[PDB]
Design a binder for these strands. Structure first.
Ligand code: MG
Ligand code: ZN
Lengths: 1314, 552, 100
DNA sequence: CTCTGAATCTCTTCCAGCACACATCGGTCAGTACGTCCC
RNA sequence: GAUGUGUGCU
DNA sequence: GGGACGTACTGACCGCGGAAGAGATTCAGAG
């Protein structure tokens, strides 16, 4: 335990709850998606082949032109990551797919004439996934976010209190397939079933059921129930069902109990309902009127004439009574309806339905789909069988089938992919039963109704769209294909697949930039769950229900991480311990809790399954047996935080960090602050900016260790070993014994990324953090990137703080900064700006890059070389020409400054390369020779040792052996034997390896020395990188880790700042009148803890500077690392070393790092104990002394260490003014933006302010002279430059533009008169 | 639009015109060759559709054929819509001689002048600089003066200070909601790159220093200079156009300084002595002999308008605070002394300024507010009002009240499990008893905070008001109210739900101690609800105000 | 190019006081129309101010007087808008003095 | 033998301000010169 | 240059 | 010696929302 890299800074913490499961791989979402997408699989359940099989093997009409799938092969990586990123080309890879082509015998059984099997016909170029989990397209890095949408399937909805100003609660269902058209079953305020296509005209829902080959009697029995009637002798009558009889009245009297029963007119209670079974009465007597007061069910046909007696769904009337009496039918069947048990919805909707034939249904559907079209039998049949009865134009996924079956109390999760002719009836019956008052609808808030679409799913969808859109041309070509005179190469075109994949990856709604300005931003931009995009909603159409949080987000979606603005609740962030389900849902771990024993075995539960069990809370003590140390515990069943019995729980949370995400878990003492500022703090930690030399945060959360490890900017030890050579950019690590591959071997090499441009014009670098002659274990850090320190995440710096007003400079939210900060250079940042050049071809003449341009003196044309490129490392200023080009002075833009650090040249055939490009090529070739030669030598030493040891046997010397060279030993001979045979074999291997490395170096030189492809119509591309060295200054924005923002007001001398009794000055001073209002009390405890840490560090530094003995330091460290209550961090310093203790103490001189988990932080008592351990006062408040008066204050003031940061809102990037600049073209008006000399926009609401005053000439010259008058402003300028201040009216040209646009529109308009 | 390198793009109208001309030529050709009627009717349909697409779009078939999923723009789209010609280039225009940056606070500035960076001033006033240079003969042609100001000589700074000396400017915050959104000030050169602004004026703009940006504008004609100096001058805007209440009310810091300045204690340094006037009172304070606040007999020479503008002097001997006598030094002639005898909170100083402008006039009120600002920041800096963890004392009765409420809810549960009452009645009784416990805890914490301080006075002890920092910040009315103190020290009561119901389990914890995951996860609901409300309120208010300003 | 979407003899010259053929570049030259391709000489603001027209072989209805809710054509003739859509888009006939 | 005064379906409009960085603005069939490996 | 795409501040 | 469709290379030519207002729509009360 406590490896060498995990030992230099042992971070003390306060952990009560012991850990049971560490944080998994943070980027296991996008990498998992792409891995599952790209891996081939003989079982086509997913991946590429699952998409090929749907579009692949096809057939022609009758020409026996069937192309069929066999296999494919992934193309080799053409380029690497670094060089291809420098070029600006996609990090793509070929895709060679094998296809077999057979032609059956003409008008015969399957007699294959020819079996063309073209070897991996070429098609498409798909990009690849970076190890960090990004993409490379055009030099940038896209990050495909995870889109959240609705689960394809069936559900129910409740439109309550919507229309008609009544209490109508009409319901509706919706069948959402994975691809196709929606189907809606809605009600109306007049109790009729209405079916609708996606958003088109409504119509009675019985039409689609009539269009499914059913008869009216079957339709009516399929929903309602029959009523038995029989003519025993006379007096037709209905039998008695005890449940049907329940919920009725005594129309005449209920025939039970033989003759005497419930009186005339009653509400039959359950007593008589039970009497019904007590006297088992079935059928005695019912009069004719109560029977006639309802509707018959089935049809009847005359027995004599063969005519119809009546029709289905017809009420009984005296004429029908006469017709049935004269016909003499016993078995009559009617409909048992009820306002509370069996609604007449089906019968009424069938009665309102005007049609009765299925062909009429087809005609009506075809007319509703395509109006004004001739109703054709076969066309309507094909449309009805293709709408959602086809496999190609309709496809419901297996997850959709599972959801559909689970939502209808089914058992088997299998089935077809399309809708059967029974599921419609099933969902209709379910909707009727719900309307009857059973069950309830499901709102779209439960995460079981949501599914996170990943990168692989969208890629497969776009690839399938490409396949199905090229299949049309494939079929068109094969319908008229030739016998054998051509291969499938000419049959297929690779254009549409590449076009579609480039359209989806390059210019989409989800593909976007990534923020490389902060490793935290890089790790939080990938674990982001959006709700926009195709299929989802938009930014302004909703709403109020989809924005709030539902109690199922606990542990699955972070409740307290979202960008505040027009999109709240739609850009929610994914939790820490969450995991992607196999289906695509959200799983979160839980600890298995037996009767009394809490087993450390973990599980995973979905969202729908959680609503059945009960989950305990991590804030519950236990002791070696899982038994609670309480009598009962707080739990929840369904959003019900209450008290349950102890021996009833089923599961318990893993850790307290399960509710929050990485964006908030890095905020210390979060349990004391409101979310309104925790959100701002979590965003400002994301929007940080790196510095020159980062520093460890004294108040950490413990999570800062497991962030930079899985981040991009780091150097993970692939295999442990010993440091051999590390100078500035390359690291040589000698491989250990047991970590060696068989056969040949070697060492691990590493290249460190030096100063290059990020996506937000921020610097980046990788500096070594180890010493020569030092071991290293596999899986450790080697080089720290930006804002990193020995594998610990460190965003900003830290310094003192004081909570007191000082001459009102901290008025609202301002921040005071002493000159010591800018003098010590602790907040100085680096910015890299890239400027490019073009060299195209015109018909007047090719664009030259000559270094001679007239109209300027020799002072401007002094930094350039013979080729017109500025010298590398030249201090440039504003307006200095950098690129000499003629038919063009690409000079420095006005405002930027700095120096030049790198020159890039990209050329095409036709124009030779200058000395600069040849020098760059030679430098790259020299590096590629140096590294390959180092590898060659370090591996050749082994073979020379081998041929030495072979020569040792028989004849060898010692002093006269190392004098003749190592190659001369191969020249030396020996007696013929297998010994000399091994010498010759080793010489052959030596020559083979030498020739192989020579071929490798030749190939590497040929790859780079050769020409480069680029955009057409341009020959030379010159990119120049500029670097700016800017520091802190007034107007900048700063903020801590608790949302406490502020702008720097003034920089004071060192002495004018307050100071304690020991003469030590005071750093940044905030305003103490923000804490009670904003309720961000958590920062003061952080301040006290930082003060305590710095006191301990000062004690350590004093004891080290007075050069005490190692025993005293060990004793003090044991004092420090053993305070507090029961914790898990328990080290023993009496086991490491004598030198390692000194190194650790030297590392701790800046201050002892203190970690603190989120929801079980150290209490106030332990804080005061650690204060008492030092030499600081208990209350943490010390007297001060004013730098002006030198007078003690009247109250002790709280001091300590906060943790400042630095944001991107730099004042020099916002300040922008302009007197007279360039003008627009369509309207003679100024431009906007800091670039291209823009001006401020005097908007509409500002006119209303001047309109409130009495300013007239002001507004006149505002929106008339300085804005639009092309003739007026020239005279105005000529008058101003001559001392005159006489304004002039005029004619707004924009008004003339409006007049011309209205006149060309076709409407006469013109100024009336003089 | 001519793209670089020979090639060029085109607008959306050109495609429509080309389509119309092509179909017109095709119809002419079909009429020339005497085609059958079906072909020419099809051509007429195509031409009618083309003319409809040129005159409007998105009304017949949304036919564009311009690019991939991008409806082209037509004359209706040129005029109608949000970005139509009217709202883009007629009402809200874009004006030169402007600029923007980040604002910052400055204490040493009066309320009739604002700060200004040097580079912005040199860039905006270029014509005035050119005119003054070529008038003083320091440059022959305009090219000479342009190159000289590009070289940034030293004398151009003197020329700039001369030409700006008495030239007002305008300020403008981006969200303009009322008349006071744009005001005028007099610029003063300040080295840096950020605009400094007066403290008390920031209350009118409703713009904190969290990074808000403002805009500037320079009037050209002399009439505009007069309109700015007379109408839109900051000294003329002292009362809101909505209500008669002032707008120069001190908000946050100076109010705390004054509230700490005027309040008496039980025993201080040098209590019981006498003094002639406030001058030697300030002298004793600066010497350090007497404390800031103590009961001292002093003589004052007040005034009073006896007749219609006739002042009468008189003397007195009152028992008052040293700080009150010190504050009396900046009080003008017309105000009486009984106005500064109270604690001088926020409403107190508000009505003080109100009665000041009501009696004396404009310039006395302005200079009096200025002196209040200066002395308040001075004594607030010299006060040293910090905040610590000991400043929040938690009463010991909280645990017992919570245990009593727990016993009550347990008894109610045990009574309901036998079917004595209904679910709704049980819920109502539970919420009522938790509200009662909340009220008890609130009264207990208030009693603990307001009067805990007891200090002897020559032997015997006596109760008095408290000098707790959080209590001084709450009582003075600077920031927050009693509810926030209740939430910090005591429990925050109960919480609602997205449905609107109230959870029967209250938040039985303060913010000084930690909170379990459940209570924070519950409070997240209300946090997000408030955030969404604040997000949509502006989107509604914009359209509301636009309709109201258009109707009248 | 010759008179089309852009022209010099119908709309105006490109540069101030310069004809298209280049045979005349003088401030004194005003109104001198060319003879190879007749083009006058003026500034470019007149090119911004002038306006062209186009001819048709068949009349064409307007869409705003048709589709708008206060259908002036429909309120003038008292005929439903759908039948007018059918007629104007070549779907039926209209009896214009066919014998009463 | 049918008229008109109310209850319903159905088509059209709008939603605060400001700042910053990317992509795209002719695809494809029909002419129109160079050019290299067998003939 | 116009549109579209987002991102960030009010 | 030698030639003519690949190989570019262009010329051009047709392609998850209320709320109101106003056009249909139907129902009934008789006549
Ligand atoms: Mg703000
Ligand atoms: Zn000409």
């Amino acid at each position: 335990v406590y490896s060498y890299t995990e030992k230099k800074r042992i971070r003390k913490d306060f952990g009560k709850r012991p850990q049971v499961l560490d944080v998994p791989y943070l980027l296991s979402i996008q990498l998992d998606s792409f891995q599952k997408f790209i891996e081939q699989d003989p079982e086509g359940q997913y991946g590429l082949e699952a998409a090929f099989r749907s579009v692949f093997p096809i057939q022609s009409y009758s020409g026996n032109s069937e192309l069929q799938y066999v296999s494919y092969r992934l193309g080799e990586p053409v380029f690497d990551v670094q060089e291809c990123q420098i070029r600006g080309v996609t990090y793509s890879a070929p895709l060679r797919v094998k296809l077999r082509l057979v032609i059956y015998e003409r008008e015969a059984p399957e007699g294959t004439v020819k079996d063309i099997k073209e070897q991996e016909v070429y098609m498409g170029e798909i990009p690849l996934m970076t190890d960090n989990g990004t993409f490379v397209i055009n030099g940038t890095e896209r990050v495909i976010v995870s889109q959240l949408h609705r689960s394809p399937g069936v559900f129910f909805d409740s439109d309550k209190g919507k229309t008609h100003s009544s209490g109508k609660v009409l319901y509706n269902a919706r069948i959402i397939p994975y691809r196709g058209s929606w189907l809606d079953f809605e009600f109306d305020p007049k109790d009729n079933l209405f079916v609708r296509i996606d958003r088109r005209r409504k119509l009675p829902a019985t039409i689609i059921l009539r269009a499914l080959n059913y008869t009216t009697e079957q339709i009516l029995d399929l929903f309602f129930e029959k009523v038995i009637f029989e003519i025993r002798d006379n007096k037709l009558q209905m039998e008695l069902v005890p449940e049907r009889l329940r919920g009725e009245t005594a129309s005449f009297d209920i025939e039970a109990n033989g003759k005497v029963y419930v009186e005339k007119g009653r509400r039959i209670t359950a007593r008589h309902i039970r009497q019904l079974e007590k006297d088992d009465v079935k059928l005695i007597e019912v009069p004719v009127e109560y029977i006639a007061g309802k509707v018959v069910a089935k049809d009847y046909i005359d027995e004599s004439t063969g005519e119809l007696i009546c029709a289905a769904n017809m009420e009984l009337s005296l004429d029908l009574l006469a017709k049935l009496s004269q016909s003499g039918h016993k078995r009559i069947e009617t409909l048992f309806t009820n306002d509370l048990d069996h609604g007449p919805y089906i019968s009424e909707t069938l009665r309102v339905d005007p049609t009765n034939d299925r062909l009429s249904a087809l005609v009506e559907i075809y007319r509703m789909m395509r109006p004004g079209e001739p109703p054709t039998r076969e066309a309507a049949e094909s449309l009805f069988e293709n709408l959602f009865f086809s496999e190609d134009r309709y496809d419901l996924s297996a997850v959709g089938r599972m959801k559909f079956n689970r939502s209808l109390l089914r058992e088997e999760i299998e089935g077809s992919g399309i809708l059967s002719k029974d599921d419609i009836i099933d969902v209709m019956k379910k909707l009727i039963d719900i309307r009857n008052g059973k069950g309830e609808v499901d709102d779209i808030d439960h995460l079981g109704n949501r599914r996170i679409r990943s990168v692989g799913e969208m890629a497969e969808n776009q690839f399938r769209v490409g396949l199905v859109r090229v299949e049309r041309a494939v079929k068109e070509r094969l319908s008229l294909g030739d016998l054998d005179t051509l291969m499938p190469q000419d049959m297929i075109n690779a254009k549409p697949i590449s076009a579609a994949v480039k359209e989806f990856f390059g210019s989409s709604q989800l593909s976007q930039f990534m923020d490389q300005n902060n490793p935290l931003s890089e790790i939080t931009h990938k674990r982001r769950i959006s709700a926009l995009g195709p299929g989802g909603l938009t930014r302004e159409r909703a709403g109020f229900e989809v924005r709030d949080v539902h109690p199922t987000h606990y542990g699955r979606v972070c409740p307290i991480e979202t960008p505040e603005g027009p999109n709240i609740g739609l850009i929610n962030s994914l939790s820490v311990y969450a995991q992607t389900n196999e289906y695509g849902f959200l799983e979160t771990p839980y600890r298995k809790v037996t009767d009394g024993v809490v087993t450390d075995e973990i599980h995973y539960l979905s969202a729908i399954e959680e609503g059945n069990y009960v989950i305990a809370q991590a804030n519950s003590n236990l002791d070696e047996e899982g038994h609670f140390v309480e009598d009962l515990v707080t739990c929840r069943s369904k959003g019900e935080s209450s008290l349950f019995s102890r021996d009833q729980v089923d599961y318990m949370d893993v850790s307290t960090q399960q509710v929050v995400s990485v964006g908030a878990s890095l905020i210390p003492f979060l349990e004391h602050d409101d979310a309104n500022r925790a959100l701002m703090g979590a965003n400002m930690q994301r929007q940080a900016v790196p510095t020159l030399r980062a520093d460890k945060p004294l108040v950490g959360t413990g999570m800062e260790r497991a962030v930079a490890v899985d981040s991009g900017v780091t150097a993970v030890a692939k295999r442990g070993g010993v440091v051999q050579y590390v100078d500035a950019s390359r690291i040589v690590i000698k491989v250990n014994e047991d970590e060696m591959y068989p056969g040949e071997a070697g060492i691990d090499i590493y290249n460190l990324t030096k100063y290059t441009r990020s996506n937000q014009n921020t610097c980046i670098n990788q500096m070594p953090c180890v010493s020569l002659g030092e071991p290293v274990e596999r899986g450790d850090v080697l080089a720290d990137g930006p804002s990193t320190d020995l594998g610990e995440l460190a965003l900003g710096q830290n310094m003192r703080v004081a909570f007191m007003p000082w001459n009102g400079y901290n008025f609202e939210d301002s921040i005071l900064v002493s000159e010591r900060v800018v003098q010590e250079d602790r907040f100085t940042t680096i910015h890299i700006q890239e400027l490019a050049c073009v060299s195209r071809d015109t018909k007047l003449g090719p664009e030259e890059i000559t270094a001679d341009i007239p109209n300027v003196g020799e002072a401007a044309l002094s930094k350039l070389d013979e080729s017109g490129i500025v010298y590398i490392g030249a201090e440039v200023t504003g307006g200095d020409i950098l690129v000499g080009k003629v038919t063009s002075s690409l000079r420095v833009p006005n405002g930027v400054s700095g120096t030049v650090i790198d020159v890039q040249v990209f050329t095409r055939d036709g124009v030779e390369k200058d000395k600069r490009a040849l020098e760059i090529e030679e430098m790259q070739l020299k590096q590629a020779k140096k590294d390959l030669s180092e590898e060659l030598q370090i591996l050749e030493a082994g073979l020379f040792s081998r041929i030495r040891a072979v020569l040792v046997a028989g004849g060898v010397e010692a002093e006269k052996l190392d004098k003749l060279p190592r190659d001369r030993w191969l020249e030396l001979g020996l007696t013929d034997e297998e010994k000399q045979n091994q010498l010759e074999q080793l010489a052959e291997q030596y020559d083979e390896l030498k020739h192989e490395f020579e071929k490798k170096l030749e190939a590497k030189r040929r790859k780079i020395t050769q020409g480069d492809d680029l955009a057409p119509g341009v020959l030379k591309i010159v990119k120049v990188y500029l670097a700016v060295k800017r520091r802190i200054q007034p107007g900048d924005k700063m903020a801590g880790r608790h949302g406490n923002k502020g702008v720097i007001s003034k920089i004071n001398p060192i002495e004018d700042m307050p100071y304690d009794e020991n003469g030590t000055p005071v750093d940044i001073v905030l305003n103490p009148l923000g804490v009670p209002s904003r309720m961000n009390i958590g920062q003061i405890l952080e301040t006290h803890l930082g003060m305590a840490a710095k006191g301990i560090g000062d004690k350590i530094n004093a004891m080290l500077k007075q050069q005490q003995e190692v025993a005293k330091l060990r004793e003090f460290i044991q004092r420090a690392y053993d305070l507090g209550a029961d914790v898990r961090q328990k080290v023993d310093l009496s086991t490491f070393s004598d030198e390692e203790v000194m190194r650790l103490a030297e590392n701790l001189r800046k201050g002892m790092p203190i970690a603190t988990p989120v929801f079980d932080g150290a209490k106030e008592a332990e804080i005061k104990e650690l204060l008492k351990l030092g030499d600081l006062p208990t209350s943490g408040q010390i007297r001060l002394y004013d730098g002006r008066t030198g007078e003690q204050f009247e109250r002790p003031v709280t001091v300590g260490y906060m943790y400042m940061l630095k944001l991107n809102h730099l004042v020099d990037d916002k300040m922008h003014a302009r007197s007279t600049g360039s003008y627009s073209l369509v309207t003679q008006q100024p431009l906007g933006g800091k670039a291209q000399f823009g001006g401020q926009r005097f908007g509409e609401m500002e006119v209303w302010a001047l309109e409130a005053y009495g300013a007239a000439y002001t507004l006149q010259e505002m929106l008339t002279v300085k804005s639009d008058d092309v003739n007026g402003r020239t005279k105005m300028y000529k008058n101003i430059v001559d001392g005159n201040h006489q304004m002039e009216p005029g004619m707004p040209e924009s008004f003339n533009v409006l007049l011309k646009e209205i006149r060309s529109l076709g409407i006469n308009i013109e100024l009336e008169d003089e | 639009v001519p793209l670089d390198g020979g090639r060029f793009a085109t607008s959306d109208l050109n495609d429509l015109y080309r389509r119309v001309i092509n179909r017109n030529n095709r119809l002419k050709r079909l009429l020339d060759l005497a085609a059958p009627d079906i072909i020419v009717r099809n051509e007429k349909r195509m031409l009618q559709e083309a003319v409809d697409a040129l005159l409007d779009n998105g009304r017949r078939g949304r036919a564009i054929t311009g690019s991939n999923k991008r409806p082209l723009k037509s004359l209706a789209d040129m005029i109608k819509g949000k970005q139509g010609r009217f709202r883009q280039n007629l009402l809200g225009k874009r004006v030169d001689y402007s600029g923007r940056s980040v604002i910052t606070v400055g204490p040493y500035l009066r309320l009739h002048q604002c700060g200004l960076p040097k580079k912005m001033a040199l860039e905006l006033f270029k014509p005035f600089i050119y005119g003054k240079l070529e008038l003083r003969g320091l440059a022959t042609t305009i090219k000479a003066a342009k190159k000289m100001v590009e070289r940034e000589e030293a004398v151009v700074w003197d020329i700039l200070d001369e030409v700006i000396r008495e030239h007002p400017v305008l300020l403008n915050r981006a969200p303009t909601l009322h008349r006071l959104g744009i005001q005028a000030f007099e610029p003063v050169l300040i080295e840096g790159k950020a605009i400094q602004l007066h403290p008390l004026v920031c209350a009118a703009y409703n713009a904190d220093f969290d990074g808000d940006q403002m805009a500037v504008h320079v009037p050209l004609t002399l009439e505009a200079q007069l309109e700015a100096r007379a109408l839109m001058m900051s000294t003329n805007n002292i009362l809101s156009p909505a209500n008669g209440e002032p707008i120069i009310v001190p908000s946050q810091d100076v109010v705390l300084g004054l509230y700490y300045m005027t309040r008496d204690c039980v025993n201080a340094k040098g209590e019981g002595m006498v003094l002639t006037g406030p001058k030697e009172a300030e002298r004793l304070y600066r010497s350090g002999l007497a404390s800031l606040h103590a009961r001292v007999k002093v003589r004052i020479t007040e005034y009073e308008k006896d007749a219609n503008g006739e002042l009468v002097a008189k003397t007195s001997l009152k028992d008052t605070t040293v700080g009150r006598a010190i504050l009396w030094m900046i009080v003008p002639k017309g105000l009486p002394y009984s106005i500064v005898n109270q604690a001088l909170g926020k409403k107190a100083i508000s009505k003080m300024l109100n009665t000041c402008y009501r009696i004396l006039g404009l310039k006395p009120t302005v200079i009096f507010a200025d002196q209040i600002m200066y002395t308040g920041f001075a004594y607030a800096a010299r006060s040293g009002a910090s905040v610590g963890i000991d400043d929040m004392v938690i009463p010991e009765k909280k645990h017992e009240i919570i245990s009593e409420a727990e016993a009550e809810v347990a008894e109610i549960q045990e009574q309901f499990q036998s079917g004595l009452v209904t679910a709704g009645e049980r819920y109502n009784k539970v919420i009522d008893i938790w509200a009662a416990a909340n009220d008890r805890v609130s009264k207990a914490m208030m009693d603990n905070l307001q009067t805990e301080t007891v200090i002897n006075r020559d032997g015997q002890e006596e109760k008095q008001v408290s000098f707790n920092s959080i209590y001084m910040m709450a009582d003075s009315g600077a920031r927050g109210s009693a509810a926030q103190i209740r939430q910090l020290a005591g429990m925050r009561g109960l919480m609602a739900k997205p449905d609107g119901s109230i959870i029967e389990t209250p938040i039985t914890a303060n913010f000084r101690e930690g909170l379990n995951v459940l209570q924070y996860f519950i409070s997240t609901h209300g946090a997000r609800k408030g955030l969404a409300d604040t997000a949509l309120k502006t989107a509604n208010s914009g359209y509301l105000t636009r309709r109201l300003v258009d109707v009248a | 190019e010759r008179d089309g979407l852009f022209c010099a003899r119908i709309f105006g010259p490109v540069k101030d006081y310069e004809c298209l053929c280049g045979k005349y570049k003088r401030l004194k030259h005003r109104g001198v129309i060319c003879e190879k391709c007749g083009v006058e000489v003026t500034q470019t603001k007149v090119r911004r101010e002038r306006m062209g027209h186009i001819e048709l072989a068949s009349p064409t209805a307007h869409i705003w007087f048709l589709k708008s809710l206060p259908s002036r054509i429909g309120l003038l003739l008292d005929m439903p808008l759908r039948d007018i859509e059918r007629v104007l888009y070549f779907e039926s006939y209209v009896v214009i003095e066919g014998g009463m």
